[PDB]
Amino acid sequence: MNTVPFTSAPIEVTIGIDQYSFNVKENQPFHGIKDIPIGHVHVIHFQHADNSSMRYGYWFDCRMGNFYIQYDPKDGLYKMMEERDGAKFENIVHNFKERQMMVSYPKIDEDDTWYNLTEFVQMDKIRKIVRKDENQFSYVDSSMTTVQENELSDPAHSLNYTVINFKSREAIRPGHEMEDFLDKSYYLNTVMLQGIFKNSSNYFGELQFAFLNAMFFGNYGSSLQWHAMIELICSSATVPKHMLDKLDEILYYQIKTLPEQYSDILLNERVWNICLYSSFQKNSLHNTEKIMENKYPELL
Amino acid sequence: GAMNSSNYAELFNNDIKLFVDDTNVYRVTVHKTFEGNVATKAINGCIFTLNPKTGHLFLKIIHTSVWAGQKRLSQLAKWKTAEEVSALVRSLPKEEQPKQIIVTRKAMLDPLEVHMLDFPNIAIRPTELRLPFSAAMSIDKLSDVVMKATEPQMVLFNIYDDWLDRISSYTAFSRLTLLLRALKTNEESAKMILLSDPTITIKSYHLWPSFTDEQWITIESQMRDLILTEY
Ligand SMILES: CNC(=O)CNc1ccccc1C(=O)NC
Numbered sequence A: 001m002n003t004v005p006f007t008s009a010p011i012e013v014t015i016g017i018d019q020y021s022f023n024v025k026e027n028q029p030f031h032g033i034k035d036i037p038i039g040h041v042h043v044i045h046f047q048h049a050d051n052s053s054m055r056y057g058y059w060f061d062c063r064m065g066n067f068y069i070q071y072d073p074k075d076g077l078y079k080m081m082e083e084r085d086g087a088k089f090e091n092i093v094h095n096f097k098e099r100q101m102m103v104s105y106p107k108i109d110e111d112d113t114w115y116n117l118t119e120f121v122q123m124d125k126i127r128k129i130v131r132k133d134e135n136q137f138s139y140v141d142s143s144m145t146t147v148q149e150n151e152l153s154d155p156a157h158s159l160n161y162t163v164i165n166f167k168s169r170e171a172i173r174p175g176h177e178m179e180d181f182l183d184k185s186y187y188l189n190t191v192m193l194q195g196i197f198k199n200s201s202n203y204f205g206e207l208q209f210a211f212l213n214a215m216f217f218g219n220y221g222s223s224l225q226w227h228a229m230i231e232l233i234c235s236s237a238t239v240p241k242h243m244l245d246k247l248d249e250i251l252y253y254q255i256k257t258l259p260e261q262y263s264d265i266l267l268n269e270r271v272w273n274i275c276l277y278s279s280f281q282k283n284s285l286h287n288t289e290k291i292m293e294n295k296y297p298e299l300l
Numbered sequence B: 001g002a003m004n005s006s007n008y009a010e011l012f013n014n015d016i017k018l019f020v021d022d023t024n025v026y027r028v029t030v031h032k033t034f035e036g037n038v039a040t041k042a043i044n045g046c047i048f049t050l051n052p053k054t055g056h057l058f059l060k061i062i063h064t065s066v067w068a069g070q071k072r073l074s075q076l077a078k079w080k081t082a083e084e085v086s087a088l089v090r091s092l093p094k095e096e097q098p099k100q101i102i103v104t105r106k107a108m109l110d111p112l113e114v115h116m117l118d119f120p121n122i123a124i125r126p127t128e129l130r131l132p133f134s135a136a137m138s139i140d141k142l143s144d145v146v147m148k149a150t151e152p153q154m155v156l157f158n159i160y161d162d163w164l165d166r167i168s169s170y171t172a173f174s175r176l177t178l179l180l181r182a183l184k185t186n187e188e189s190a191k192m193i194l195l196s197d198p199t200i201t202i203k204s205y206h207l208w209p210s211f212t213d214e215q216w217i218t219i220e221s222q223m224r225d226l227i228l229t230e231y
Helices: A086-098 A113-118 A123-129 A147-151 A177-182 A185-197 A200-216 A220-234 A241-257 A269-278 A286-295 B005-012 B073-091 B106-115 B133-138 B140-148 B169-185 B187-195 B213-230
Strands: A002-005 A013-017 A020-024 A032-036 A042-048 A056-060 A066-072 A077-083 A138-141 B017-021 B027-032 B038-043 B045-050 B056-062 B100-103 B123-125 B153-158
Touching (some): A002 A086, A032 A086, A042 A077, A056 A077, A056 A123, A066 A086, A113 A200, A113 A241, A123 A138, A123 A200, A185 A200, A185 A220, A200 A241, A220 A241, A220 A269, A241 A286, A269 A286, B005 B169, B017 B073, B045 B140, B056 B073, B056 B140, B100 B106, B133 B140, B133 B169, B140 B153, B169 B187, B187 B213
Parallel strands (some): A002 A066, B017 B100
Antiparallel strands (some): A013 A020, A056 A138, A066 A077, B017 B045, B027 B038, B056 B153
């Protein structure tokens, strides 16, 4: 079980750790988060009390280094840093644990939610979507735009999601215009799966990362990417049975975790109604359709 | 964006553009079977592709053989339309290709856009106008060449005859749309108006009678009245 210590908490802030969150008051004696489960990526986001509008945060994996948070009064935010001196880190953590100034990652034993939301998400793929190679962790905020958004303006601060565009030469084979536009299987299975992602695990990992970014940071471009990747599968007549079964599980847990009142600005009516009721896969997502109908019947 | 009442003179500027109407591409008669069920029988159709500035009409005749063995024909018809329009553009020299294609029905937008991906600088536009191009099969010579066709065929016409020798494109298009709106609202009446006087003839190389300027004003005047009466 790993730890992310905090140097201090100089400004009042709501701190999230994966799907959990807690309020820290200005100059409260908060020195970080302990008992973080090993084996999964994690995210630590922040929402300033004096700026409700913005959330910014860090994706990380404690197997890749010792990380801490330190407020920077010049740039005005909590920054993740790496401590390279392992003995200095162990000593800091042990002292803070001894004085009981850390919150415990509050995982219920029966609870598989975080695993189910991050099953295919890997730090190394996050770092190719969020390019900042001098750090082992990745910063994301509510305002970062995606590469495809920029095409339609700072490239260093972009989310480099895989570009999906249903009316593009990549998507449409010359001479199969109607066939490829109404049945996207060749774009899914050959162009994206075999060509770009290599396997369905990487596809699902980017889909899951996009959702998490979309829900946790309220990032609009990430929400576009999540829906696009769902729609590409649902609009394909020919999808491996294992992918459909896994997709149903993936979406089930995303819909289960979504805040009920943050759903109207996040869920795209057209995509969901197409996917659940018109698409080739209208009959293949039983768990997702049942939770959608019981939790958001209005959208449908 | 959409073509409408407000940006109407754009049709007659010097940027090449084409209207595409797909209404008459897939045409059927509906009949009873011996068992008392209903079936359709396709008849030849056409794509109506028109330069509104010059009057040039590219009438691609759609022979019923193109539907043989195919399903979801109304959907296929829109993609066939977009395939044929794309092939037409590719056959034209670069300096003759359109800068815009305006589709008369919104359901043609995605099929045409996908077929024209090779032509990113050709704008595909809808319209808010309720244009009467479906009535083109009420023009006798056009209906005649479509029904007689035994194979796919492209036939070229000027739907303005020689009018542009005497009137502007704007006026020509207005006359065309008026005649077609009339033929659509009451084909029998409209046609009576046009041929009532036997001394006015249709030249072999024309679609409409050889009215003088004064006779066109009379003609245009009953047609606007035929339209008011039907409404
Ligand atoms: C995913 N939709 C959302 O509204 C996420 N929610 C936030 C995201 C960024 C900043 C603030 C909030 C918030 O507390 N309420 C909206």
